[PDB]
Design an enzyme around this catalytic site. Structure first.
Site, mmCIF file in Angstrom:
data_model
loop_
_atom_site.group_PDB
_atom_site.id
_atom_site.type_symbol
_atom_site.label_atom_id
_atom_site.label_comp_id
_atom_site.label_asym_id
_atom_site.label_seq_id
_atom_site.Cartn_x
_atom_site.Cartn_y
_atom_site.Cartn_z
ATOM 1 N N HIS A 192 96.591 59.006 27.423
ATOM 2 C CA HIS A 192 97.030 58.214 28.575
ATOM 3 C C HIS A 192 97.951 57.048 28.192
ATOM 4 O O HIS A 192 98.719 56.555 29.023
ATOM 5 C CB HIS A 192 95.842 57.769 29.442
ATOM 6 C CG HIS A 192 95.228 56.470 29.028
ATOM 7 N ND1 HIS A 192 94.073 56.395 28.282
ATOM 8 C CD2 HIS A 192 95.605 55.193 29.266
ATOM 9 C CE1 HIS A 192 93.766 55.129 28.074
ATOM 10 N NE2 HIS A 192 94.678 54.377 28.663
ATOM 11 N N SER B 4 92.875 50.451 24.914
ATOM 12 C CA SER B 4 93.006 51.910 25.026
ATOM 13 C C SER B 4 93.715 52.530 23.829
ATOM 14 O O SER B 4 94.735 51.998 23.351
ATOM 15 C CB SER B 4 93.772 52.294 26.291
ATOM 16 O OG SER B 4 93.019 52.040 27.470
HETATM 17 O O1 LIG Z 1 90.424 52.174 32.693
HETATM 18 C C1 LIG Z 1 90.350 51.636 33.799
HETATM 19 C C2 LIG Z 1 90.427 50.131 34.062
HETATM 20 N N1 LIG Z 1 91.505 49.474 33.354
HETATM 21 S S1 LIG Z 1 91.210 48.424 32.178
HETATM 22 O O2 LIG Z 1 92.535 48.181 31.706
HETATM 23 O O3 LIG Z 1 90.422 47.345 32.673
HETATM 24 C C3 LIG Z 1 90.287 49.241 30.898
HETATM 25 C C4 LIG Z 1 90.944 50.185 30.092
HETATM 26 C C5 LIG Z 1 90.253 50.832 29.096
HETATM 27 C C6 LIG Z 1 88.881 50.551 28.887
HETATM 28 C C7 LIG Z 1 88.159 51.205 27.879
HETATM 29 C C8 LIG Z 1 86.832 50.901 27.690
HETATM 30 CL CL1 LIG Z 1 85.985 51.751 26.432
HETATM 31 C C9 LIG Z 1 86.160 49.969 28.471
HETATM 32 C C10 LIG Z 1 86.844 49.317 29.465
HETATM 33 C C11 LIG Z 1 88.215 49.601 29.695
HETATM 34 C C12 LIG Z 1 88.957 48.953 30.718
HETATM 35 C C13 LIG Z 1 90.557 50.031 35.575
HETATM 36 C C14 LIG Z 1 90.004 51.349 36.094
HETATM 37 N N2 LIG Z 1 90.167 52.280 34.971
HETATM 38 C C15 LIG Z 1 90.092 53.708 35.088
HETATM 39 C C16 LIG Z 1 91.039 54.568 34.516
HETATM 40 C C17 LIG Z 1 90.912 55.952 34.668
HETATM 41 C C18 LIG Z 1 89.844 56.512 35.385
HETATM 42 C C19 LIG Z 1 89.731 58.017 35.536
HETATM 43 C C20 LIG Z 1 88.404 58.617 35.058
HETATM 44 C C21 LIG Z 1 87.986 59.624 36.118
HETATM 45 C C22 LIG Z 1 88.896 59.382 37.320
HETATM 46 N N3 LIG Z 1 89.940 58.438 36.930
HETATM 47 C C23 LIG Z 1 88.890 55.658 35.947
HETATM 48 C C24 LIG Z 1 89.031 54.287 35.788
HETATM 49 F F1 LIG Z 1 88.100 53.504 36.351
#
Ligand SMILES: O=C1[C@@H](NS(=O)(=O)c2ccc3cc(Cl)ccc3c2)CCN1c1ccc([C@H]2CCCN2)cc1F
Ligand SMILES: [Ca+2]
Ligand SMILES: [Mg+2]
Lengths: 233, 52
Positions: free
Chosen positions: A42, A185
């Site tokens: 991603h 990520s």
């Molecule tokens: O990763 C995030 C969040 N962004 S973040 O930048 O705060 C973030 C990014 C990566 C993270 C990795 C870990 Cl291990 C923990 C917190 C994180 C938080 C916001 C929502 N989100 C997200 C992305 C993809 C999915 C998909 C799965 C099924 C359907 N769609 C679900 C999500 F909730």
């Protein structure tokens, strides 16, 4: 990384940082060998062109060990979909080999059966990166690490608003305010066994950062060991 | 707890059960020691070691 500690000198030498045209980090990676970086699929949509930096712990200063590497080949898992985040894995082949040194060294790739029986059954793993230090905030200028408990697979499925596939696992805390976050990520989840660190996960996604009742979701590296091996050859 | 389930078969790294006995092995960049248990680095920057 929300909570956790700074990576001190030499503590997170397998950390890689994907940097855009503006020389800013937007995702992490794990050094696998002199030519290869492990990251999240991603992350490949977050920058048109990018390079890989290794040996960096402070994006504000020159520590003397930093090295930028251009990417020769991008190997994205063909089954990755933005809709489910399933198969969130990619391998990068660099144009020039990484020179190992203080703060620059590969994490070990484990064998599947052994990793699943012995590494993933450990109490905790370690996640690292230059990501946000609060759900709302800017990227950290300092490399951070965080010890994250492995989470029971049942509890994790119950906690999640979305399907946790067999290519994913959960780690972190139910309520304690520590987790990976935006910009982490693609970065490493490693597990220590007898002072040797093995790559066990790729920072993938989370419903926000450090939220109560939610965990960090990671790509399960053990599910892709053959794929990784093929990609490296 | 037996063989590989008993303190990782006394192996530094990978533990396998062949026949009814422990067989240890190591990640790339390491060689199995003469005792068939420990893993010895081949260079100054073996995988998985902090550079302290
Ligand atoms: O990763 C995030 C969040 N962004 S973040 O930048 O705060 C973030 C990014 C990566 C993270 C990795 C870990 Cl291990 C923990 C917190 C994180 C938080 C916001 C929502 N989100 C997200 C992305 C993809 C999915 C998909 C799965 C099924 C359907 N769609 C679900 C999500 F909730
Ligand atoms: Ca620096
Ligand atoms: Mg939580």
């Amino acid at each position: 990384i929300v909570g956790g500690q700074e990576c001190k000198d030499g503590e997170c030498p397998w950390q890689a940082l994907l940097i855009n045209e503006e020389n800013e980090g937007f995702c992490g990676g794990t050094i696998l060998s002199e030519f290869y970086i492990l990251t999240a699929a991603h992350c490949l949509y977050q920058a048109k062109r990018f390079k890989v930096r290794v040996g960096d712990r402070n994006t504000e200063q020159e520590e003397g060990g930093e090295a930028v590497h251009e990417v020769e080949v991008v190997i994205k898992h063909n089954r990755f979909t933005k809709e489910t985040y399933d198969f969130d894995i990619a391998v990068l082949r660099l144009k020039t080999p990484i020179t190992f040194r203080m703060n620059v060294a590969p994490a070990c790739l484990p064998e599947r059966d052994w990793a699943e029986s012995t590494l993933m059954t450990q109490k905790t793993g370690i996640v690292s990166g230059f990501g946000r230090t609060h759900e709302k905030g800017r990227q950290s200028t300092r490399l951070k690490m965080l010890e994250v408990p492995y989470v029971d697979r049942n509890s994790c499925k119950l906690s999640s608003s979305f399907i946790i596939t067999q290519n994913m696992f959960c780690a972190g805390y139910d309520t304690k305010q520590e987790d990976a976050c935006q910009g982490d990520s693609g970065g490493p989840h490693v597990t220590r066994f007898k002072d040797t660190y093995f790559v066990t996960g790729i920072v993938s996604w989370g419903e926000g950062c450090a939220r109560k009742g939610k965990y960090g979701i990671y790509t399960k590296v053990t599910a892709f060991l053959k794929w990784i091996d093929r990609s490296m050859k | 707890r037996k063989l590989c389930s008993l303190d990782n078969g006394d192996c530094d790294q990978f533990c396998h059960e062949e026949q009814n006995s422990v067989v240890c092995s190591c990640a790339r960049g390491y060689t199995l020691a003469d005792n068939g248990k420990a893993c010895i680095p081949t260079g100054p920057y073996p995988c998985g070691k902090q550079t302290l």
